[PDB]
Amino acid sequence: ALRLLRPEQVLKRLAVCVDTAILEDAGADVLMEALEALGCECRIEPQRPARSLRWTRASPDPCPPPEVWAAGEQELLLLLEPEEFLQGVATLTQWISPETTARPHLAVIGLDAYLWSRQHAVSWPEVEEALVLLQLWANLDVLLVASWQELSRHVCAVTKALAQYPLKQYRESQAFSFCTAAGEPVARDGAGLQAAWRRQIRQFSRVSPAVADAVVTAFPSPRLLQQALEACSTERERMGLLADLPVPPSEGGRPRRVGPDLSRRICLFLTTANPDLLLDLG
Amino acid sequence: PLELRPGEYRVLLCVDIGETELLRELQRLHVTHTVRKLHVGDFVWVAQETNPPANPGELVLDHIVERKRLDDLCSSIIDGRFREQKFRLKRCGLERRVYLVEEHGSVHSLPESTLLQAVTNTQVIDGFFVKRTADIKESAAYLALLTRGLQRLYQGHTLRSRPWGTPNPLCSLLTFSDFNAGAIKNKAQSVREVFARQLMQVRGVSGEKAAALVDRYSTPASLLAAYDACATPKEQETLLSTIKCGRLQGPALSRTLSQLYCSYGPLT
């Protein structure tokens, strides 16, 4: 059971369905030139809003065995003429949406050329307020571009985003709650454990790998570091045991050390019995 | 234990301290705002109690903005800080989340293709709303318009107080006490978090596997003390094989962790 679905093998299962009335601008071919080079499926067929395009991800053909591939439509860009856009800006002084299944989107090509030759009804701050009103009421962005290439740049960027989405969700979910990514190989005689123990110190927050090697050079086993902590008399010696350990100075001759914050965090890692203890805040 | 009554309450902006400049520009557009320390994000709105002990009970609106300038955006992505940074924004209990991007100079440090992709990944996959502004003063003008919408969106709605246990203009909000301290311990590294993360630095140690070890021994003192009490070294080599390993619920893999955690010689 190998069972692998990368971004490059579900972009084959990605499909972009683009309305035929897109083509009445002869600069629309730039999209087709660019989204055939990407290996997603192109569908030139009439669409649920007209002069719009939508995305389609369907589950692969043998089909295993986990449960969610995130199949369905899941994105839809509705393209608008600038004067059709400026109607709805004037509507939102005192609603370009139907209600369909996927996440809605708007684009307008060449707006700031259009408002110059007409104005320079409404103007720019009426538009700027209406983008905020489209934001707040209906979670709705409008992609203001200046060419068909910039439209096609974003249309390809959406399409690479929808191919990488099922990879990312199966490491978001189905990873237990500490991850936010492989293991050091160990032989029969240990013998790679020191490079693993070096990286265990690097799993503390705010630790450069130069700092992490300075911990392990001093104390090359876990039992060699707890034995050094238990040889201290006062708790201050425990919290400052690793603090005086020299570090590469890093681009300026000012020499560095490991320092007290990490030295106390390692101290009340191994000595504490409270697993809910916060080592730091941030 | 709070209600905000619609007859009077205060809808105002909270800004983070690290904006040292936008604070000059924001006062001109008549935006009612205070400056506070915010533990996740850079911009947030609260519902102040209007006439309380000069200590308002404050409910926090379901909107967060994080502003990365594009220069520091490239920095924060190329060192792995970015995925940790968005994940904190994703898990903060304010779930209409906006990602504000300022230009601030030339575009060419990282290429055009890869920067546009990650922003559109943040738009699509991570669920954020992307606003792109050109300078400091357009984004302040954006947040001016974004503030006066949220006043008008909450006019005459009645607001109540959720616990940290969890369209429509969203009432029943978190309080600002529950928000900050909830954001504190999202990013706060606990002993259990590290010890789980440390265990999976070994080849063969996985997420269901390491949380099983953490279920049996919650702190690293207890794994060492379990090793302390068992008498012969065959026991410590075979201590861990009987854990509740998996969703489903390693014999020689108990061996190699005991080589890490019982050897008083140096490792190799």
Indicate yes or no: CB of A224 within 8 angstroms of CB of B191. no
* Measured distance CA(B61)–CA(A103) in Å, rounded: 23
**B229 and B176 in one domain?**
no
**B117 and B231 in one domain?**
no
Q: Flag whether residue B252 sits within 8 Å of chain A, measured between CB atoms.
A: no
Q: Tokens for B222, please give them.
A: 């207890």
**A248 and A154 in one domain?**
no
Pairing of strands B10-15, B33-35: parallel
Residues B39 and A282: beta-carbon distance below 8 Å: yes
Q: Tokens for B17, please give them.
A: 């301290």
Note the helical H segments in chain B: 22-28, 70-78, 81-90, 112-124, 136-153, 176-187, 191-199, 207-216, 220-229, 233-237, 253-261
Q: Which of residues 1-20 of B touch A (CB under 8 A)?
A: none
* Measured distance CA(B203)–CA(B198) in Å, rounded: 12
**A18 and A142 in one domain?**
yes
**B64 and B45 in one domain?**
yes
Question: Under the phi-then-psi rule, with left for phi > 0, alpha for psi from -120 to 50, and beta for the rest, what region is B72?
Answer: alpha
**A28 and A162 in one domain?**
yes
Specify the residue for token string 């490079």. A195
Cβ neighbourhood burial of A209 (10 Å; 0-12, 13-18, 19+): exposed
Q: What is the DSSP letter of B136?
A: H
Residues B254 and B240: beta-carbon distance below 8 Å: yes
Report the candidate in B67, B147, B140, B77 with the shortest Cα–Cα distance to residue B109. B77
Indicate yes or no: CB of A227 within 8 angstroms of CB of B264. yes
- Output the CA torsion A273→A278→B1→B6 (10° steps): -170
Note the helical H segments in chain A: 29-35, 82-91, 111-118, 124-138, 148-172, 193-201, 209-218, 222-230, 235-239, 260-270
CB nearest to A183's CB, from B124, B150, B200: B200
CB nearest to B124's CB, from A132, A161, A275: A161
Q: How many domains does chain A have?
A: 2
**B228 and B139 in one domain?**
no
Q: Flag whether residue A133 sits within 8 Å of chain B, measured between CB atoms.
A: yes
Q: Which domain holds residue B153?
A: 1-188
* Measured distance CA(B165)–CA(B163) in Å, rounded: 5
**A239 and A164 in one domain?**
no
**A154 and A242 in one domain?**
no
* Measured distance CA(A78)–CA(B194) in Å, rounded: 47
Which residues lie across from A105 on neighbouring strands?
Answer: A77
Contacts of A88 (CB under 8 A, 6+ apart): A95, A96, A130
Describe the strand order of the beta sheet including A14-18 as a list of residue ranges: A41-44, A14-18, A52-57, A76-80, A104-109, A142-145
**Listed residues B188, B208, B225: the one ending a domain:** B188
**Listed residues B188, B214, B238: the one ending a domain:** B188
* Measured distance CA(B98)–CA(A132) in Å, rounded: 12
Evaluate whether residue A42 is within a structural domain: yes
**A136 and A27 in one domain?**
yes
**B206 and B113 in one domain?**
no
Contacts of B232 (CB under 8 A, 6+ apart): none
**Listed residues A121, A140, A172: the one ending a domain:** A172
The angle at the Cα of A198, spanning A192 to A204, to the nearest 5 degrees, equals 140
**B254 and B126 in one domain?**
no
**B180 and B202 in one domain?**
no
**A166 and A93 in one domain?**
yes
List of chain A residues whose C-beta atoms are within 8 Å of the C-beta of residue B185: 278
Quote the radius of gyration of chain A (alpha carbons, Å).
29
Evaluate whether residue A279 is within a structural domain: no
CATH code at position A241 = 1.10.150.670
- Output the CA torsion B177→B181→B183→B184 (10° steps): 150
Q: How many domains does chain B have?
A: 2
* Measured distance CA(B144)–CA(B141) in Å, rounded: 5
**Listed residues B188, B212, B246: the one ending a domain:** B188
- Give CA B160 to chain center in angstroms: 24
**B247 and B169 in one domain?**
no
Pairing of strands A256-257, B10-15: unpaired
For residue A273, give the chain B residue with the closest CA.
Answer: B219
**B199 and B136 in one domain?**
no
Note the helical H segments in A2-123: 29-35, 82-91, 111-118
* Measured distance CA(B222)–CA(B219) in Å, rounded: 6
Evaluate whether residue A180 is within a structural domain: no
List of chain A residues whose C-beta atoms are within 8 Å of the C-beta of residue B87: 180
For residue B122, give the chain A residue with the closest CA.
Answer: A161
Experimental method: X-ray
Which residues lie across from B43 on neighbouring strands?
Answer: B15, B65
**A163 and A75 in one domain?**
yes
* Measured distance CA(B146)–CA(B151) in Å, rounded: 9
Q: Please give the positions of B annotated as active site.
A: 16, 19, 42
* Measured distance CA(A212)–CA(B199) in Å, rounded: 16
Note the helical H segments in B70-161: 70-78, 81-90, 112-124, 136-153
For chain B, the first-to-last Cα distance in angstroms comes to: 57
CATH code at position A97 = 3.40.50.10130
Evaluate whether residue A188 is within a structural domain: no
**B210 and B107 in one domain?**
no
Residue B42 annotated as lining a ligand binding site? yes
* Measured distance CA(B80)–CA(B69) in Å, rounded: 17
Residues B99 and B120: beta-carbon distance below 8 Å: no
Q: Tokens for A203, please give them.
A: 């799993």
Residues B141 and B102: beta-carbon distance below 8 Å: no
**A214 and A78 in one domain?**
no
Q: After which residues is chain B broken (C to N over 2.5 A)?
A: 20, 52, 108, 166, 249
**Listed residues A138, A172, A206: the one ending a domain:** A172
Pairing of strands B3-4, B159-160: antiparallel
Amino acid at site B49 = E
**Listed residues A108, A142, A172: the one ending a domain:** A172
CA distances from A149 to A40, A54, B36 (A): 18, 18, 42
Residues A111 and A130: beta-carbon distance below 8 Å: no
**B165 and B253 in one domain?**
no
- Give CA A78 to chain center in angstroms: 24
* Measured distance CA(B30)–CA(B239) in Å, rounded: 67
**A95 and A64 in one domain?**
yes
**Helices and strands, number each (H, E), in chain A:** 10, 8
CA distance A117 to chain B (A): 23
Contacts of B141 (CB under 8 A, 6+ apart): A128, B25, B29
Evaluate whether residue A59 is within a structural domain: yes
Evaluate whether residue A106 is within a structural domain: yes
**A30 and A95 in one domain?**
yes
Q: Which domain holds residue A20?
A: 7-172
Other C-beta atoms lying within 10 Å of the C-beta of residue A67? 5
B220-229 vs A222-230: helix crossing angle, rounded to 10: 90
**A214 and A161 in one domain?**
no
**B165 and B195 in one domain?**
no
Specify the residue for token string 């002069």. A51
